[PDB]
Symmetry: C4
Subunit: 388 residues, 4 copies
């Protein structure tokens, strides 16, 4: 086994093909299935895995009441092969109410954060063992990606944040070799508020598209230089913006360097990637809530903040159906690196009041250089009929 370098060009992408779907909530009406949220996908050189943060309970279980909360001592990172729903033989790979995972070509890293809000601990687990950990630095909800980290030549990078969700926070980028933190660069450049980064290998570096929870409905970009540890940051130029809430398409605007100051408060985790000067990007369909999910290409969307020329739109989840977090993951082909993305389909509280729980299922699409048609792939559980 050799370390992954991802030193191959990015695949031609004409859009996305369906890849995976676990029907987790549907199964949980007649089965023992974990309550989760903040799911994500990452893949060893052979095959893909689905991760999520458990609420240390199954759905049809008294302990699923009030699983709307974000941080309890009972949350663990779940890990299965992709398409195996989180049943009772699912391995909890660490304790975590915030996490990130990646495989360097030899072994799995996990970055798992748990403990007190005001004094959390991040654990660094590599190859079945604990190799390091760091305390919260700013004593305000140390947190990380909720999607895959990225390793080049055996140096893995991950973005973490400590501080305010609605003010200046303290974001850092760690470099990790075999579970050992070998460096920490602090955030730099024009990105003002950075969270839940969706990162992908862009040889020789790593690129991330994050969530601005403060004053931006455009999404921050973070550029990580793996060799000299330098950081740069900015925003996705595209005039059609990827966060939620946001303004409508006719009213929205963006800026390559600053938050747009348009319904900037709050956000949702999401993703984008460059294709020459164009941007591929997913986003919720409904501008203010986590309803529906779409992907498209914005032509000149990576370089031109006035550009609002979308082509190749796809509905992933129709506008009347709930979506949630989404994020990138990268899969190596024979000749190129593909881009795929998962979407968290959230069900339950607070938005749906028919039940007491909050859970999710997932749907997963992958870059394609072939052709594709249309559809919608929602959660499809009936919360009127579920465990009363």
């Amino acid at each position: 086994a050799e370390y992954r370098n991802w030193s191959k060009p990015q695949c031609d992408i004409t859009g996305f093909a369906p890849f995976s779907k676990d029907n987790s909530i549907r199964l949980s009406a007649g089965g023992d299935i974990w309550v989760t949220r903040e799911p994500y996908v990452s893949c060893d050189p052979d095959k893909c895995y689905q991760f999520a943060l458990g609420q240390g309970t199954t759905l049809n279980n008294v302990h699923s009441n009030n699983t709307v909360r974000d941080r309890t001592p009972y949350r663990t990172l779940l890990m299965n092969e992709l398409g195996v729903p989180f049943h009772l033989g699912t391995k909890q790979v660490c304790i975590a109410w915030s996490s990130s995972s990646c495989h360097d070509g030899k072994a799995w890293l996990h970055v798992c954060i748990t403990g007190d809000d005001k004094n959390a601990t991040a654990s660094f687990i590599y190859n079945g063992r604990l190799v390091d950990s760091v305390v919260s630095w700013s004593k305000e909800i140390l947190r990380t990606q909720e999607s895959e980290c990225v390793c080049i030549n055996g140096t893995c990078t991950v973005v973490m944040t400590d501080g305010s969700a609605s003010g200046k926070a303290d974001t850092k980028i760690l470099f990790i070799e075999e579970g050992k933190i070998v460096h920490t660069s602090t955030l730099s450049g024009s990105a003002q508020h950075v969270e839940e980064c969706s990162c992908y290998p862009r040889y020789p570096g790593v690129r991330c598209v994050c969530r601005d929870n403060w004053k931006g409905s455009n999404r921050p970009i973070v550029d990580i230089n793996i060799k000299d540890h330098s950081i740069v940051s900015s925003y996705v130029c595209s005039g059609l913006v990827g966060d939620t809430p946001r303004k409508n398409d006719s009213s929205s605007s963006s800026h390559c360097l600053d938050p747009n100051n348009e319904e900037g408060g709050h956000g949702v985790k999401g993703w984008a990637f460059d294709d020459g000067n164009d941007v591929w990007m997913g986003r919720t369909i409904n501008e203010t809530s986590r309803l529906g999910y779409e992907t498209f290409k914005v032509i000149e969307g990576w370089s031109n903040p006035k550009s609002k020329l979308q082509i190749n739109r796809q509905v992933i989840v129709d506008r009347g159906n709930r979506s949630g977090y989404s994020g990138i993951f990268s899969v190596e082909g024979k000749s190129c690196i593909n881009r795929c993305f998962y979407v968290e389909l959230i069900r339950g509280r607070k938005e749906e009041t028919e039940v007491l729980w909050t859970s999710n299922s997932i749907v997963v699409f992958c870059g394609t250089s072939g052709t594709y048609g249309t559809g919608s792939w929602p959660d499809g559980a009936d919360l009127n009929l579920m465990p009363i």
Copy 2:
């Protein structure tokens, strides 16, 4: 690992021996078992796997109501080792309401079709990754085999159909190397309506026996030339015909080149294979519904459309018990290639009204050059007693 070529002669077959049975519906009265249909078997060089299309629900689950429908966004391709029933730790290998799978000797291909009726997408998954996809070409329920595809020398072939179920449709044969569509030949020859092909390696080519849903109760044959991509087609000569509905044995007739025009409308998926000039073939026992299942040899049945000389009959499922789809799969021995076949045992709606669901179990027999006796191996669930 080397690519499979199947460059070995076909085994002497004197009939079929019992191989596998999952009792899926019986287990589902006291267990968490998936609702499925369109099951099938395919085997890597070591061992066999059972696939089926899930309805994204378990049987004892509110979501099993109305699982009679064919295409929902919740259907996925299920995959276990043969004889492991589809429990909750079953891997969904892709999203699909129509599929085909095969192993080329190195890795698994899956061909998974999902999305809108009038604009479906076929995804091509090889070795744990998405390598290609194609849109529906005729915008009318792009669909495929519901049984194993076939790979020779690392070129896999699969038959797909788009268009009318009861008129001229647009059938194509794809050639796939490592998940990449490297060619598409369109259907040619005398076969007029072609669906749900049951294909097997017949070195140096591939042979398929399909379902004529339009004007034929005799079954179409499709001959696929793997090297030059040429296609030829015709029908199973045998005067005892393999589709259902059909006429009775005294009234039936057939034709080597054309549909017989005898209760041709509709059909059921099924299979046949040549043995010199004789044909081995399975079929439902009841001429008009999916009740019972039998296999026999028709002597001269491959070359002579007037020949109705059966020998070596076996009852697989007795005439008072429900059957369903059936299909071939091919297993490599030390010196020869064996032919085996699975039978879908369908239970529930519309035919059985005691429950609200529609599911299936499977039974699997294999070619034998030894001897065998008799029996019947039905589903054996009591739908009067099941999840009310």
Copy 3:
């Protein structure tokens, strides 16, 4: 991987140590566990597996009513690693209401019999594929060991029986190389009625200790010569006899060559093995029913039919607790071949009327050259409290 030869001496045995126990019925009061009977153990070169014949249902399942019957089309051979109870992810390795399994050092053989009483089929499955089969020869319940077969140098042997359970039957010994029946020797020597053999490698041959269902409460011995295919047969000399029913210890007698004619009708599957001129043997404690289970050494018990000198008695299951079938299996050590034995703990009908079902759990002991103490290891389920 090389074929097993078992060309090592038998381990010193001073008695038996506890090895495994699955608590199958206890677990099945709060879990999805298979209904089984006729369980057994066999081991690949690395590790041990537990097999049993399923009733194609779980215990807490409507279909468990009337599982007292021996042959239904829903019975399959179950296979797990030893100590994993038969849950829903258990693999059914073939269809079978009678079976035998062994590993030759390279791959697993299974011998699986199913179908009509008066015309059953035995399937021979090797290395994940069907290689052969034979019909019933005497058209009266073709049946086999219900415990492991034995392979030396890649020739596996198995004992099968067709005919009367209470008269002369037709017993044969098959020789199988890679799933292919390469010879059939018919039973010969003084053994008059032979069933459910418990066989073990006794280099250069195989030795078996069977059940006389007709006129003998002493147990038949069958000696299988693997190279020239010759058979010899006789009975376990020991004056303390191993079948059930039997006479009491003060009244019993035996004979090295003939059935003893003492409560000979019926029997239970069981086992014995030679140790110089002494015999190690297990048996039910209660002389007339399947209650309790004991093991001991009878000094001179292998050569002297008048000898009733037991030493080293161990209670495995105390006399007030149900037992059932038992059988040998052989495990290779660094320098010697060990002998271990499993015991079927039967619960339910007809004997226990509190429930409608018939099932079993297992307990497994192994030869030891160290020391040991005492105890009892029954089923331990409360049938008064179980699934009403």
Copy 4:
């Protein structure tokens, strides 16, 4: 594969980071989960496993009533990968109401004790086979560690005890090569009562920190010389003592050689390890019951029995939440050997009367040379709402 020697220095430890947590009791309110106690962790060269002693029942199961008892014939040693909760596909690796496990680098040893109180049997299982066993020597509850054993150069050592829990007992240390007892040294040195040792490799030997159930609330130390089989023993000097019950911090005292005679009766399993002349140690927070759990360093705590200088305290389970047994396990890094520890979170009878059962979940922390913060990680099940 080579034998483990652990010939690497012990890792710098500044405290402990969170590693694993199974939420076993929480899951068991809506799932089929085993009733356990006496859990523990041990790891093969690749990855970690969680063991526990089952009560041969699941929690939501009639047979969970009265699982407060310590020794029944239904208890087995459970084994999963760490973080997989004990579901129904969990392997029982042997019969046992007392056990110890370790991997020598090639294969697993298990030491499993079961049978009559006054005549128990220890079975020695190596590499999937029974290699040895010993009887109880003093006929009074032969028992062992309830945590991992230790192997150096293919010689594994384990500490066992037979005799009184509240008087002089007969403790021995066995040496085991490939499952074969190759020597037995009897306990020697100043340790007066020794139980449930927590052992770790301290090249070239093994060191253990045990429980004095008789007259000591300080913990015994046992030093095992692997090459010449010599034993020495004494007590943990530290003035803050690790057993429970114990006196408060202001009143407690200790002694390097003798039991302290302070609430010495009874105890709880626990652990400690040297760091120069300082001791790392865990213990319950509440001085008299198994409530809370803390770890700290006592400076000079290994050499100075008057020293009560703790630094680096961590709360693992807060003082209002139940704890239980805890023990060490050792994990090999690139350059050093790490120390990790698990904590049994006991729920149910006798202490909690809301239910009839007694079970546990686990939480697992590992040595870290990085930094960490704070929290509490209790069981988190609501016994008011659980299976009534």
